Amino acid sequence: EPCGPVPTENQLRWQDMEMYAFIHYSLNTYTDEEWGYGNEDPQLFNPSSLDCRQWARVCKQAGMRGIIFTAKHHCGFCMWPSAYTEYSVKNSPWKNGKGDVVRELADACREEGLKFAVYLSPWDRNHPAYGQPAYVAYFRNQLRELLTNYGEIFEVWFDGANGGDGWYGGANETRKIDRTTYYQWPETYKMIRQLQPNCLIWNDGSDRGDLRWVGTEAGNVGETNWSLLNHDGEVEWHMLHYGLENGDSWVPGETNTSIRPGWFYHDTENEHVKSLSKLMDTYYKSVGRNSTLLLNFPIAPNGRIHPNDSLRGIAFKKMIGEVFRKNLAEKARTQTKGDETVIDFGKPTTFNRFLAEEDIRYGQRVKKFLLEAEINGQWQQLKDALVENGDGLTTIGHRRIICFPTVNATKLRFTVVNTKCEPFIKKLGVYLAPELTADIPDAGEKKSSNLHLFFSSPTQMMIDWETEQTITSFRYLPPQESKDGTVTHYTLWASTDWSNWTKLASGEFSNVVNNPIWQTIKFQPVRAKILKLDADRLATGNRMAYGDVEVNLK
Ligand code: NA
Ligand code: NA
């Protein structure tokens, strides 16, 4: 009964995993860097307390259905005793060079009932022949090892990220490849299919794999999300984030992000494990937007996931269970006339979530829908409160969840406005999510939790919005866990065009160490799109830290 491209059985089961974990752990875990350069010393790999069973337990307790593990990241250090390199745990002090992290994690996923997956970085900064054909054969030999010796692999991840320069066996060169042709993916893809016929291939930047990136690391996919791409030709950013309405291939998007600002463990980020409200936001913008959530939990130098991350994951899984515990549509009278479905609760009913699912076994069909609630005898249009322009009511696909201000309503109407073919709605749901407040245990809410906060480097932090903003003040809170990167001087810029621009500040945080209270920066209202905070000397370290920041508006 189909309509446009349809997913394979593998792609259906993957989609139903809903959330699974990423785990990043490499030599740069020990150098406090997001990337390793390729000459990090394997002697660094010496955790005091490694336990892959803890990783699996933590992930399972956050509601993850599997784990994708960095068997090898960009620096090229291998987490399993490959036959093809010495740059691996064969030559680390951990278990006297006799350990295999891929094995222990595979076993632990098995023990905890989690699916297991591997990330094998195509870009390799250690290998002397990177960018030459000999590295391609090395890559495949290693991939053969991972898909032969560790049981069932649910996904294989080929990062598109490439920074050009690396140690490269001592050459210290910057090397350029043609990403469309260098890795020779088709021969590699055949091997994957042969060794692991149930495995889904994620790739970005070249030959289409079974899954696609969503074009950002922030943890969202488009409010419009077609699980389609075309098989051939270049993929624009817009196609990653929103998919392609008439794409000739089912290539569903995977929403990847970290539970911390960085992918790897950093001590200064222990205070910034994303809050419950931020993760719920990500949930609604991944699982709630026809995607899966790939949430990264990094391993600390001691070989364990940090307890902050663990506690937050549990609070997250708990809240998701609470929001969706009671489908209010279940007791209601539901009927469909034409393109209109009315859920009649029979009495005034309080809710703030709507959920629809298409039966995507038969493809993705809905292009546009409407939501109305009958409030005091009058129909009122609802919209997606998480979408800034438009009502956000376009595609549905695997699952679409719509948040809106809580209403007290006797009926809700769901209308399929536009569709490719006759829609097959497999499920409809209505729910009352509880208030997200700071005092929820382990929620970790901060004033900055849902600001788009990132750094450029350790003098400078930046904030930005989607729309343009009239900013009347800015506040800085020093770190309260430890004082390592406390900011003493500060200068603060605003901007409308990303060109850094205009200066608000010049100051000095007074007695900020012996008195870590909120610091307020005074300035005339600026219209701005971006803020820019400079650390002008850092009290005890090399990366500026903060407890929290607040941006006030008109
Ligand atoms: Na393919
Ligand atoms: Na909140």
Ligand nearest to the CA of 251: 1
Copy the structure tokens of residue 19.
């959330």
Closest of 122, 115, 363, 410 to residue 249, by C-alpha: 363
Report d(CA 55, CA 146) in Å as an integer. 19
- CB within 8 Å of 344: residues ≥ 6 apart: 332, 333, 334, 335, 410, 411
| Partner residues linked to 212 by β-bridges | 253
CB-count burial class (<10 Å; 0-12, 13-18, 19+) for 19: buried
CB-count burial class (<10 Å; 0-12, 13-18, 19+) for 144: middle
Altogether, the residues listed in the chain come to a count of 554
Closest of 281, 436, 431, 284 to residue 354, by C-alpha: 431
Homologous superfamily (CATH) of 9-324 is Glycosidases (3.20.20.80)
Using the Cα atoms of residue 232, residue 235, residue 240 and residue 246 in order, give the sign of their dihedral. Answer: negative
Ligand nearest to the CA of 278: 2
Report d(CA 358, CA 364) in Å as an integer. 7
Report d(CA 393, CA 368) in Å as an integer. 6
What one-character-per-residue DSSP string does 326-394 give?
--TTTTSEEEEETTEEEEEEEEEEEEEEEEEEE-GGG---EEEEEEEEEETTEEEEE--TT-SSS----
Long-range (24+ apart) CB contacts under 8 A made by 268-274 are 268/479, 268/484, 268/485, 268/541, 268/543, 268/545, 270/306, 270/308, 270/481, 271/479, 271/480, 271/481, 271/545, 271/547, 273/306, 273/308, 273/309, 273/312, 273/444, 274/312, 274/444, 274/449
Q: What is the DSSP letter of 536?
A: S
Ligand nearest to the CA of 209: 1
According to DSSP, the β-strands at 460-477 and 519-534 are antiparallel
Q: Cα separations (Å) of 154 from 60, 202, 215, 284?
A: 16, 11, 22, 24
Chain centre to alpha carbon of residue 397 = 20
Ligand nearest to the CA of 433: 2
Ligand nearest to the CA of 188: 1
Using the Cα atoms of residue 124, residue 130, residue 131 and residue 134 in order, give the sign of their dihedral. Answer: negative
Burial 177-202 (b: 16+ CB within 10 A, else e): bebeebbebeebbeebeeebeebbbb
Report d(CA 358, CA 424) in Å as an integer. 6
Q: What is the DSSP letter of 18?
A: -
CA dihedral of residues 41, 46, 47, 53 (deg, nearest 10): 100
H or E element at residue 294: strand 292-296
Q: How far is the CA of 185 from the centre of ligand 1 (A)?
A: 10
| Partner residues linked to 230 by β-bridges | none
According to DSSP, the β-strands at 292-296 and 19-23 are parallel
Ligand nearest to the CA of 448: 2
Report d(CA 534, CA 457) in Å as an integer. 10
Q: How far is the CA of 445 from the centre of ligand 2 (A)?
A: 6
Report d(CA 101, CA 45) in Å as an integer. 11
Ligand nearest to the CA of 280: 2
Q: How far is the CA of 92 from the centre of ligand 1 (A)?
A: 37
Report d(CA 245, CA 391) in Å as an integer. 19
Q: How far is the CA of 54 from the centre of ligand 1 (A)?
A: 35
**Which amino acid is residue 509, in one-letter code?**
F
Q: Are 88 and 82 in contact (CB under 8 A)?
A: yes
Q: Quickly tell me which residue has 């809410």 as its tokens.
A: 445
Q: Are 328 and 405 in contact (CB under 8 A)?
A: no
Which SS3 state, helix, strand or coil, does residue 125 take? coil
| Partner residues linked to 520 by β-bridges | 475
Q: Quickly tell me which residue has 């497999």 as its tokens.
A: 426
CB-count burial class (<10 Å; 0-12, 13-18, 19+) for 129: middle
Report d(CA 291, CA 253) in Å as an integer. 6
Three-state DSSP string of 443-459: CCCCCCCCCEEEEEECC
The maximal CA–CA distance of the chain, rounded, in angstroms, is 75
**Which amino acid is residue 4, in one-letter code?**
G
Q: How far is the CA of 11 from the centre of ligand 1 (A)?
A: 12
Q: Are 505 and 491 in contact (CB under 8 A)?
A: yes
- Indicate which technique resolved this structure: X-ray
Using the Cα atoms of residue 481, residue 275, residue 349 and residue 431 in order, give the sign of their dihedral. Answer: negative
What one-character-per-residue DSSP string does 40-91 give?
--GGG---SS--HHHHHHHHHHTT-SEEEEEEE-TT--BSS--SS-SSBGGG
- Strand spans (E) along 93-223: 115-120, 155-158, 200-203, 212-213
Ligand nearest to the CA of 185: 1
Copy the structure tokens of residue 157.
């991840």
Q: Are 521 and 484 in contact (CB under 8 A)?
A: no
Q: Are 399 and 319 in contact (CB under 8 A)?
A: no
Q: How far is the CA of 275 from the centre of ligand 1 (A)?
A: 37
Q: How far is the CA of 202 from the centre of ligand 1 (A)?
A: 10
Copy the structure tokens of residue 75.
């620096």
Closest of 121, 136, 128 to residue 168, by C-alpha: 128
- Upper half-sphere CA count for residue 352 (Cβ side, 13 Å): 12
Q: How far is the CA of 278 from the centre of ligand 2 (A)?
A: 9
Q: How far is the CA of 144 from the centre of ligand 1 (A)?
A: 18
* Distance between start and end Cα atoms, the chain: 54
Q: Which strands form 253-258's sheet, in the order they lie side by side? A: 200-203, 155-158, 115-120, 66-72, 19-23, 292-296, 253-258, 212-213
Ligand nearest to the CA of 449: 2
**What Rg do the C-alpha atoms of the chain give, in angstroms?**
25
Copy the structure tokens of residue 480.
């309260």
Determine what percent of the chain falls in helix, strand and coil, rounding each to the nearest 5.
Answer: 20, 30, 50
Which SS3 state, helix, strand or coil, does residue 29 take? helix
Ligand nearest to the CA of 201: 1
Q: How far is the CA of 316 from the centre of ligand 2 (A)?
A: 13
